[model samples]
Target: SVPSQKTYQGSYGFRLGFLHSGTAKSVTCTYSPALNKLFCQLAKTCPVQLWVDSTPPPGTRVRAMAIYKQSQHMTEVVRRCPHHERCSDSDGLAPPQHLIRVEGNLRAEYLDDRNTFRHSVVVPCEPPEVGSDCTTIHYNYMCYSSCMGGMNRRPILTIITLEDSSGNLLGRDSFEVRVCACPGRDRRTEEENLRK
Candidate 1:
């Protein structure tokens, strides 16, 4: 194809595809039993953990957990695929000076090979945190593309979750996420559909 076209994101939040006649987007998701949650498989049948958070409701407490493949050292994964930034200093922290302070807990869990646990898992929950403040919530998620790789990571999954950790039998929460990719050449640009 010629260079006259660029990918476009729809007003309805759909991102166009360069190859197939479809839309694609990246989602930094969270799985809160508190809300209706959903997710897609990132790789060829792998293990994953519960990806949930609390950036919603009246007060969102910062909590996160992710899973990724790794080499012997847990670093240097397969060609940027089959793995994530496999760092293991996993713990919790709090830097002062934020109105968004949690009255409870934030955490991380390494659920080895749990991605295979659930496929297209959709949980019926709600972002209860969203009900705390504004009519429109500020559900937050941080997505990094390694900009250099243009999402070179092929089969990667991160399951985030949040709980009070105060030994309380609590209800679940909800979350939302999306995916995206940068520009690249398409071999199809050389052909025009006869129907056109």
Candidate 2:
């Protein structure tokens, strides 16, 4: 079953906070029990710098790292062939092997004189699948009608893990990326139009 509209709203809130400032900022994210992951939206047009906070386990140093991967849910959604039923059996609807890509500097940064880890990620505005119908509209390039259902929004699953000095995993949190045309816009409104 697809997530409810409320879930998407919560994700949108985080995105608004992250993009609120010109410099790197931090946003609070809520974990969704139903989805078993944290949801957050981000614009796909450019690289975005953000921070993911972590608390080290007792008796362990604060060592956290970010890992990026294609969301399995999104992969299935893309493979279902939202555009044409016949394309499901063909490679026409297959998305790129990697839908999300990220890179970061290996240095500590100061946000309000507090030490924080900053990471930069780039999510393409347009779907990587062949024959995607994306517009060149400014701040609205991602066409919402190309994919099946609400699957036009590709998701990237990002996991930030806390480790000890010895590289032993201590704690981990996962976030699902909502790569959208405009992070600031409400997608719920679009859903209503689609249903009409």
Candidate 3:
């Protein structure tokens, strides 16, 4: 179980399932004009939880309103991610190597978090050279969660892009990743306590 599951019901009776697991590093908002409400929850990572009064974790921020909507409102949320720590440090894990290369100003997204890579490569919006257009290259990503070792876990896909100073596409690479709950700490602690 991913801890307490029944929480963060929206002002308009929005179900938890519709909110979708969001990222903690970016900004997110919810609205209910009929309820005259607007909310902004920030720094919410996967398996996102909204407690009535629970303090957010380190490097997290949240703002929500219990307010109404006269006009329909909509917003878009785009995301990518770096790897989580536990999976990358697994025993006998090997580094990911560059697998493919493409030309033109291109960047990959969320490739490393899903593979066995250490670092993620990103491209700047603009090149050092003059008059270079900056565009982002995105890949498909699905952060699926499952139960493992009595803990909930999710896999991350990370992407790396190599670009030149002039925003020219250089190359791209990717890898796999997994972010499990208490990979070592939980099991070790339980066993040691049992010995006592």
Candidate 4:
């Protein structure tokens, strides 16, 4: 006699996530009121956790690229150049000043205690370098202002695309990091201060 119903199991893996300070959690970019600038936590580096659900086989190579997703309001803000005297948009759509910098060795590490494998890459907190004339209108400020208070408050969208050994599409994910006056503060308080 056979069972009335058959059991089936399926596995859907291959996804990308992030980590900071060796913990699997979300991290935010910080806005320094004293310096009047935005920066990431953990010494200005954000560690990306690749393959959180499943680990790739040995000898597998991975590459990551990050892009900024700015809204229409952000573009308009950049055009106005509120804090800069010399600012021009002669450059292409996505200029270096509007992008984040991702760098580090793409490698897998074994966590003996956790009995799990993890792949990691680091993203420097600083934005891409632009000419001195456009420093004040950089992406950091664009993101911060666009996301400050109001209903328009949105975290900067940094999409990370992963490629395989043969340059094939492995997977893609996004890391949303908030650039605000308060770092590691509760959402409610941060929202209130961002209104300023």
Candidate 4: regions farther than 4 A off: 1-12, 19-43, 52-98, 103-155, 186-196
Q: Across residues 30-110, which tens digit of lDDT does each residue of candidate 1 receive? A: 222221122222211111222222232322222222223222322322122122323221124322111011221333121
Which candidate leads in TM-score? 4
RMSD (Å) per prediction: 15.6, 15.8, 20.2, 16.2
lDDT sort, best first: 4, 2, 3, 1
Q: Candidate 2 overall Cα lDDT vs. reference?
A: 0.29
lDDT, candidate 2, 1-196, per-residue tens: 2211121212111111122221112322222333333333331332232222332233432221222234355223222223333333322222222222232222221111123222212222222135522212111112222244534445434443333445454444444444433322323333345568
Model 2, runs deviating above 4 Å: 1-105, 108-154, 186-196
TM-score against native, each model: 0.25, 0.30, 0.20, 0.38
Error of 4 at 142 (Å): 12
Q: lDDT (CA) for every model shown?
A: 0.23, 0.29, 0.25, 0.32
